[PDB]
């Protein structure tokens, strides 16, 4: 028992569908390095949005191949924490600490950045104007204190210092998984699909225009892991599709792969970062700065330094990063993602507001004009609608905001000849312009934000009803007691299966027992048939209780 | 507490009927609806504030002339000529208005700004008005359901 | 209502076979088996 008790933390078991079509459990070893780099917060963090994208956009088939794919951006992350964790040479030496400082401290500074966003427009509260230095105006802090403008000036400063480490620390923190997911894709599209081979992509496809750039560069598969997928292309694409013409698009040459498969000796590379910036790879660094100048967080990024910039032109463009607690907490996000979640039909049903109002303009401009005059002055008439850009824009305007319809600022229809024909006319305004289209639009994003939240708290829910591997749901397990918790923790455990993972990738070929070279091999071929789908131990041996 | 406060002061007195919410069911279930969406709605009123200080960025450095509330030629009353006195008078009576922001302000025609008070208003009215409030409305009726 | 109903006509055509009704989650077993089902099976064009 006691041997069993300390290295129940190091005995991860997950269960495969073997080779003889049955659910066989594997018992491998988790590192302690291993286990301490999937339980920081930022893992935790990436596993919890995987879960979330795959449980909301569905698909039990591909289920488990984005699960394969999570799991090698994840590794790939804390292989970029591991390196991040805690005159030329000094100088490289003190750069790599203080890009290190910005990585790890990336979203303290975030913190700092909206700390100081706030602050600093919590001075421009104060802000008056005055036709008096502190036709022209003057607008000045009013503090008694005295000290609000050397701390306004201060903190804006700061800020966008902060802004500049908040970039450095993304390039250096998030890009690179960015540049692995683009370089993995690329590199498994030109494997299987051989789409620059055979299916060239279309004028859609401006990501595949882009990639276009790499198939040449000799440090395509720099990010990513497998440096031979050039070779590889050529193995399965260029014996029937051109040898010389598949190793043009990739860029390589027949010989010098030929004695990179011989024995040869690797130089040395020349002293000196002068040599470097010559040896720096102009089109795939063109590439990766175009990949990275699309990717949506760095253009936040960008355009938050851009308003830190003008926040030194005029102070109050620092009110614009206050969005960013929009940005930073969850359901405000929702509340954002609502106005656009039907955008296509918030817009198209504005443009029947559109329509409908311009029908009652044309009707309220061919009749009912002596109706417009919102000037209380005899002399001056203020007549809304004799032209019908200006009826258009005044119903557009007042009508649709005012709650009983344009009657309530028109003339009143009494002692007139069209006195029931301007009753039914701002009836029907009323009705459908306010009670029913405005309330239309506000369907249309207060459920969107209501259908967001089902949707995280379904995704919540059904967690904790099937597993995410054989999706067997709770009411087989929960027979025993504790079963489901059982199940998903010691029988099928998402993060076992990670660890399962890394024990493959660190453990030399020549150890892997079969079931481990098995797994290997299935991953090697990318069929993802080794995972349970629809059984499990517990059902395969359920009449001998195991 | 309140009682003997209620010697003091016979209005002290309570303070005390609210315990028929404390007693009956879904009145207290009433109160119970306020805070049980209660980090949600702290957070939205929240974006509710920035949003409107933001409306108030706008309507200060641009949009200050309609602020004069006061009819009186002679003394104005211009709520948007400092920050403080601009963004009280947004979260206080904007919020409340049901049209927006433009019941209480100037008319926007005959003036060069004329197209963007317009843009100005239909956005407060819309995000302001139409969303967030209704947004607090169902955090708290939907909480109470 | 009615956005509901169409929602519920695309969800019920992925969940049942139009022809023989039987539901995905018998074809679900199979990895792809509503897919092979509905396409390969009993595709209705294939019935015109
Ligand atoms: C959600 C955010 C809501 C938060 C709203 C906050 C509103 C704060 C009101 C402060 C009033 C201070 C005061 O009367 O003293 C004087 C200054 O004195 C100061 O300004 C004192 C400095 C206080 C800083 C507190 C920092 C706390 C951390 C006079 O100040 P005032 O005349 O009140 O203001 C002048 C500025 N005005 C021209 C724009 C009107
Ligand atoms: C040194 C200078 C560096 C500067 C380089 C900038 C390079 C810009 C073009 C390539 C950027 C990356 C890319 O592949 O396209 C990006 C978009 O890109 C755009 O929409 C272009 C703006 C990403 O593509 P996508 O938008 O996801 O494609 C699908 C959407 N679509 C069908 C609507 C297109
Ligand atoms: C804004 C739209 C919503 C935000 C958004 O989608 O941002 C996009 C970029 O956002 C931009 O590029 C900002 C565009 C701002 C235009 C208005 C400027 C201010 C007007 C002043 C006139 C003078 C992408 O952001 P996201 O990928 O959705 O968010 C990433 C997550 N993160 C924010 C935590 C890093
Ligand atoms: C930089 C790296 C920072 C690294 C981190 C370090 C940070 C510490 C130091 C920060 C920088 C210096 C600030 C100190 C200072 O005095 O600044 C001054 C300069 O102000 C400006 O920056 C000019 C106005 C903005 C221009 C650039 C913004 C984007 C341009 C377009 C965006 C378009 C959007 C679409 C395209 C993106 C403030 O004074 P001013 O009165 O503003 O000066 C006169 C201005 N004038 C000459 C114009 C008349
Ligand atoms: C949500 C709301 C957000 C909005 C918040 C701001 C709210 C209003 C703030 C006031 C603006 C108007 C104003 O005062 O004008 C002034 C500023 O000069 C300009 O306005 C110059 C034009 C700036 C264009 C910015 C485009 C940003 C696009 C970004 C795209 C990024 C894409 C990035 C992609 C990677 C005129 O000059 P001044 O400064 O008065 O000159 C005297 C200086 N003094 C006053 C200091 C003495
Ligand atoms: C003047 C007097 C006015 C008085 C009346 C005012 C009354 C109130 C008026 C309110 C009007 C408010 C409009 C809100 C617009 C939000 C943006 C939007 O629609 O995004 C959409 C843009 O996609 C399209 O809809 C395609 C066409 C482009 C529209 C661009 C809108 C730009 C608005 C400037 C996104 O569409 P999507 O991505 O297809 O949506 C599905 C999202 N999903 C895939 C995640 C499920
Ligand atoms: C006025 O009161 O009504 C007029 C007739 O009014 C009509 O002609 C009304 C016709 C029916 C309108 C409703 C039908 C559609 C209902 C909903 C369908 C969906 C009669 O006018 P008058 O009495 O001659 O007015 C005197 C004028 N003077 C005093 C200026 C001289
Ligand atoms: C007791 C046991 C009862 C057992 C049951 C038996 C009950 C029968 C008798 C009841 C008590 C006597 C009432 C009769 C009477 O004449 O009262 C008088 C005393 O009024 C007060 O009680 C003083 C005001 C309240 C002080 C204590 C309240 C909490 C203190 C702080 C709470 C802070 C909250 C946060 C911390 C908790 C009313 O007259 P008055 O005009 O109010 O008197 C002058 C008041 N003065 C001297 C102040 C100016
Ligand atoms: C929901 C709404 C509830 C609210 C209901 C009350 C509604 C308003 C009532 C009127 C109040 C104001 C007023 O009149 O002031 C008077 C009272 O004096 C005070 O106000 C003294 C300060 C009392 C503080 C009480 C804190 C309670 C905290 C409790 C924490 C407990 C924690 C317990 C934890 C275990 C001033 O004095 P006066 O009485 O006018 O003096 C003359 C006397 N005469 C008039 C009789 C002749
Ligand atoms: C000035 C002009 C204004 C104009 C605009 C006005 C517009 C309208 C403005 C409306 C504003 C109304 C605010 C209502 C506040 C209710 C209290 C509350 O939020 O409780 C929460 C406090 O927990 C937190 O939210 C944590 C942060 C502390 C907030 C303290 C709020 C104090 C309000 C003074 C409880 O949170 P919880 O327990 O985590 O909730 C889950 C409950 N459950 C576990 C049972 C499921
Ligand atoms: C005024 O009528 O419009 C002006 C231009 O107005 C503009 O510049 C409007 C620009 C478009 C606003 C809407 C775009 C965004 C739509 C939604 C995006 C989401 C023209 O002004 P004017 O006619 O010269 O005014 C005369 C002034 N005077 C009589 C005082 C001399
Ligand atoms: N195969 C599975 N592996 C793990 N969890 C599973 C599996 N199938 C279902 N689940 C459910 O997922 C839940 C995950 O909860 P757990 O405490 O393990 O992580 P978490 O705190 O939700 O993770 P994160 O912080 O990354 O969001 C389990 O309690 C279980 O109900
Ligand atoms: N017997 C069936 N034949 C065809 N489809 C079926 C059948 N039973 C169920 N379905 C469902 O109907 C779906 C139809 O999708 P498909 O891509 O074939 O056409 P579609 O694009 O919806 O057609 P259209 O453009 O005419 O609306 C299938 O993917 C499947 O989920
Ligand atoms: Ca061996
Ligand atoms: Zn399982
Ligand atoms: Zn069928």
């Given at each position: 028992?006691?041997?069993?008790?300390?290295?129940?933390?190091?005995?991860?078991?997950?269960?495969?569908?073997?080779?003889?079509?049955?659910?066989?459990?594997?018992?491998?070893?988790?590192?302690?390095?291993?286990?301490?780099?999937?339980?920081?917060?930022?893992?935790?963090?990436?596993?919890?949005?995987?879960?979330?994208?795959?449980?909301?956009?569905?698909?039990?088939?591909?289920?488990?191949?984005?699960?394969?794919?999570?799991?090698?951006?994840?590794?790939?992350?804390?292989?970029?924490?591991?390196?991040?964790?805690?005159?030329?040479?000094?100088?490289?030496?003190?750069?790599?600490?203080?890009?290190?400082?910005?990585?790890?401290?990336?979203?303290?500074?975030?913190?700092?950045?909206?700390?100081?966003?706030?602050?600093?427009?919590?001075?421009?509260?104060?802000?008056?104007?005055?036709?008096?230095?502190?036709?022209?105006?003057?607008?000045?802090?009013?503090?008694?204190?005295?000290?609000?403008?050397?701390?306004?000036?201060?903190?804006?400063?700061?800020?966008?210092?902060?802004?500049?480490?908040?970039?450095?620390?993304?390039?250096?923190?998030?890009?690179?998984?960015?540049?692995?997911?683009?370089?993995?894709?690329?590199?498994?599209?030109?494997?299987?699909?051989?789409?620059?081979?055979?299916?060239?992509?279309?004028?859609?496809?401006?990501?595949?225009?882009?990639?276009?750039?790499?198939?040449?560069?000799?440090?395509?598969?720099?990010?990513?892991?497998?440096?031979?997928?050039?070779?590889?292309?050529?193995?399965?694409?260029?014996?029937?599709?051109?040898?010389?013409?598949?190793?043009?698009?990739?860029?390589?040459?027949?010989?010098?792969?030929?004695?990179?498969?011989?024995?040869?000796?690797?130089?040395?590379?020349?002293?000196?970062?002068?040599?470097?910036?010559?040896?720096?790879?102009?089109?795939?660094?063109?590439?990766?700065?175009?990949?990275?100048?699309?990717?949506?967080?760095?253009?936040?990024?960008?355009?938050?330094?851009?308003?830190?910039?003008?926040?030194?032109?005029?102070?109050?463009?620092?009110?614009?990063?206050?969005?960013?607690?929009?940005?930073?907490?969850?359901?405000?996000?929702?509340?954002?993602?609502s106005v656009?979640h039907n955008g296509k039909q918030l817009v198209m049903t504005v443009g029947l507001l559109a329509v409908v109002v311009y029908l009652y303009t044309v009707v309220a401009f061919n009749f009912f004009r002596k109706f417009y005059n919102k000037s209380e002055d005899?002399?001056?008439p203020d007549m809304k609608c004799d032209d019908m850009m200006t009826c258009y824009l005044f119903h557009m305007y007042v009508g649709v905001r005012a709650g009983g319809g344009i009657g309530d600022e028109i003339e009143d229809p009494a002692g007139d000849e069209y006195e029931l024909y301007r009753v039914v006319f701002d009836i029907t305004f009323f009705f459908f312009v306010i009670v029913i289209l405005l309330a239309i639009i506000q369907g249309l994003i207060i459920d969107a934000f209501g259908?967001?939240?089902?949707?995280?708290?379904?995704?919540?829910?059904?967690?904790?009803?099937?597993?995410?591997?054989?999706?067997?749901?709770?009411?087989?397990?929960?027979?025993?007691?504790?079963?489901?918790?059982?199940?998903?923790?010691?029988?099928?455990?998402?993060?076992?299966?990670?660890?399962?993972?890394?024990?493959?990738?660190?453990?030399?070929?020549?150890?892997?027992?079969?079931?481990?070279?098995?797994?290997?091999?299935?991953?090697?071929?990318?069929?993802?048939?080794?995972?349970?789908?629809?059984?499990?131990?517990?059902?395969?041996?359920?009449?001998?209780?195991?």
């Amino acid at each position: 028992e006691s041997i069993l008790e300390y290295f129940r933390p190091y005995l991860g078991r997950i269960e495969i569908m073997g080779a003889s079509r049955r659910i066989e459990r594997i018992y491998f070893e988790i590192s302690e390095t291993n286990r301490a780099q999937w339980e920081m917060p930022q893992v935790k963090e990436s596993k919890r949005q995987f879960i979330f994208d795959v449980v909301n956009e569905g698909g039990e088939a591909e289920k488990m191949e984005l699960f394969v794919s999570f799991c090698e951006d994840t590794i790939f992350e804390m292989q970029i924490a591991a390196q991040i964790s805690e005159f030329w040479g000094e100088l490289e030496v003190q750069r790599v600490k203080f890009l290190n400082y910005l990585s790890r401290n990336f979203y303290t500074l975030r913190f700092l950045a909206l700390f100081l966003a706030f602050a600093i427009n919590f001075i421009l509260l104060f802000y008056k104007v005055s036709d008096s230095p502190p036709n022209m105006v003057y607008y000045f802090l009013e503090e008694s204190t005295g000290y609000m403008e050397p701390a306004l000036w201060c903190l804006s400063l700061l800020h966008t210092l902060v802004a500049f480490l908040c970039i450095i620390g993304y390039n250096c923190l998030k890009v690179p998984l960015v540049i692995f997911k683009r370089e993995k894709e690329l590199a498994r599209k030109l494997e299987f699909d051989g789409l620059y081979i055979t299916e060239q992509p279309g004028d859609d496809d401006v990501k595949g225009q882009w990639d276009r750039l790499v198939l040449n560069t000799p440090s395509f598969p720099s990010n990513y892991w497998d440096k031979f997928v050039k070779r590889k292309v050529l193995d399965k694409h260029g014996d029937i599709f051109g040898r010389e013409r598949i190793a043009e698009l990739l860029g390589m040459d027949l010989a010098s792969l030929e004695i990179t498969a011989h024995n040869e000796r690797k130089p040395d590379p020349p002293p000196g970062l002068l040599t470097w910036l010559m040896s720096i790879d102009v089109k795939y660094q063109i590439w990766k700065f175009g990949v990275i100048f699309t990717d949506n967080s760095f253009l936040y990024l960008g355009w938050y330094m851009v308003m830190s910039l003008l926040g030194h032109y005029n102070n109050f463009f620092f009110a614009a990063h206050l969005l960013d607690i929009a940005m930073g907490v969850k359901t405000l996000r929702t509340i954002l993602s609502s106005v656009t979640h039907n955008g296509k039909q918030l817009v198209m049903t504005v443009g029947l507001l559109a329509v409908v109002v311009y029908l009652y303009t044309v009707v309220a401009f061919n009749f009912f004009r002596k109706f417009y005059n919102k000037s209380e002055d005899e002399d001056e008439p203020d007549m809304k609608c004799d032209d019908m850009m200006t009826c258009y824009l005044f119903h557009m305007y007042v009508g649709v905001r005012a709650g009983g319809g344009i009657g309530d600022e028109i003339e009143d229809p009494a002692g007139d000849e069209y006195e029931l024909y301007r009753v039914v006319f701002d009836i029907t305004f009323f009705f459908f312009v306010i009670v029913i289209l405005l309330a239309i639009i506000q369907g249309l994003i207060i459920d969107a934000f209501g259908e967001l939240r089902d949707q995280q708290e379904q995704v919540k829910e059904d967690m904790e009803t099937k597993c995410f591997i054989c999706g067997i749901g709770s009411d087989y397990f929960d027979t025993t007691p504790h079963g489901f918790e059982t199940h998903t923790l010691e029988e099928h455990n998402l993060a076992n299966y990670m660890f399962f993972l890394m024990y493959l990738i660190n453990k030399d070929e020549t150890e892997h027992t079969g079931q481990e070279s098995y797994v290997w091999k299935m991953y090697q071929e990318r069929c993802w048939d080794f995972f349970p789908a629809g059984d499990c131990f517990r059902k395969q041996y359920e009449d001998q209780l195991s």
